[PDB]
From Swiss-Prot, chain A:
Assembly mode: The basal body constitutes a major portion of the flagellar organelle and consists of a number of rings mounted on a central rod. In Gram-negative bacteria, at least four rings, L, P, S and M are present, whereas Gram-positive bacteria lack the L and P rings. The rod consists of about 26 subunits of FlgG in the distal portion, and FlgB, FlgC and FlgF build up the proximal portion of the rod with about 6 subunits each.
Main localization (coarse): other
GO biological process, one term: bacterial-type flagellum-dependent cell motility
Keywords from the named record: Bacterial flagellum
Compartment annotation: Bacterial flagellum basal body
Disruption phenotype: Defects in flagellar assembly process.
Listed InterPro entries: Flag_bb_rod_N, Flagellar_basal_body_rod_CS, FlgB
The name this protein goes by in its record: Flagellar basal body rod protein FlgB
Family (UniProt): Belongs to the flagella basal body rod proteins family.
Transmembrane segments: none
GO cellular component, one term: bacterial-type flagellum basal body, rod
Record-linked Pfam families: Flg_bb_rod
Keyword Isomerase annotated: no
UniProtKB/Swiss-Prot annotation, chain B:
Binding partners and assembly: The basal body constitutes a major portion of the flagellar organelle and consists of five rings (E,L,P,S, and M) mounted on a central rod. The rod consists of about 26 subunits of FlgG in the distal portion, and FlgB, FlgC and FlgF are thought to build up the proximal portion of the rod with about 6 subunits each.
Family: Belongs to the flagella basal body rod proteins family.
Portion of the parent chain present: 52 to 101 of 251
Organism lineage string: Bacteria, Pseudomonadati, Pseudomonadota, Gammaproteobacteria, Enterobacterales
Species annotation: Salmonella typhimurium (strain LT2 / SGSC1412 / ATCC 700720)
Subcellular location: Bacterial flagellum basal body
Segment forming the signal sequence: none
Protein name: Flagellar basal-body rod protein FlgF
Length: 119, 50
């Protein structure tokens, strides 16, 4: 209980990082599909929401209970998709580094605990 | 709004008359400027020509 609660914030943040990267990869895959609005999630609000109330799924075809918001387009396009590649690749790299940061923090905490237990 | 595309178009045709070749034949005729001869078109309809 105590150990589960202490490691729950970073674990949930890392899971939300994984889901956000899945969404960003879906946006990158559909970058040339005509009529596809780019989707993204508000990381902080959804993280607090998952924090207060546990993770839930729409079904389980299954998907998370996250709110898929639409990204504001930069410039218009005749085909009708709002996937701007610069934004997609910047968010992809930023999410990548933040996921690596979450892995580093969680691994440091778990070693910081094995150090105590080991004897 | 930054992206504006190009579309080719053909807005009608040019009605400036050309140069008349004088041929000593009674059946070759030339109309006045902005005048048209009438023929029965291919599909039983009416068409105009120079």
């Amino acid at each position: 209980d105590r150990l589960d609660a202490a490691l729950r914030f970073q674990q949930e943040a890392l899971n939300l990082r994984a889901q956000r990267q899945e969404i960003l990869a879906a946006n990158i895959a559909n970058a040339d599909t005509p009529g596809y609005q780019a989707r993204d999630i508000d990381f902080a609000s959804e993280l607090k929401k998952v924090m207060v109330r546990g993770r839930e799924e729409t079904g389980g075809v299954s998907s998370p209970a996250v709110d898929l918001l639409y990204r504001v387009p930069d410039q218009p396009s005749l085909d009708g998709n709002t996937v701007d590649m610069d934004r997609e690749r910047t968010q992809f790299a930023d999410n990548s580094l933040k996921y690596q940061m979450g892995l580093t923090v969680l691994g440091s905490q778990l070693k910081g605990m094995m150090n105590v237990l080991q004897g | 709004a930054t992206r504006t595309l190009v579309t080719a178009s053909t807005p009608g045709a040019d009605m400036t008359p050309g140069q008349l070749d004088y041929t000593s034949r009674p059946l070759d005729v030339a109309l006045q400027q902005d005048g048209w001869l009438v023929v029965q078109a291919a599909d039983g309809a009416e068409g105009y020509t120079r």
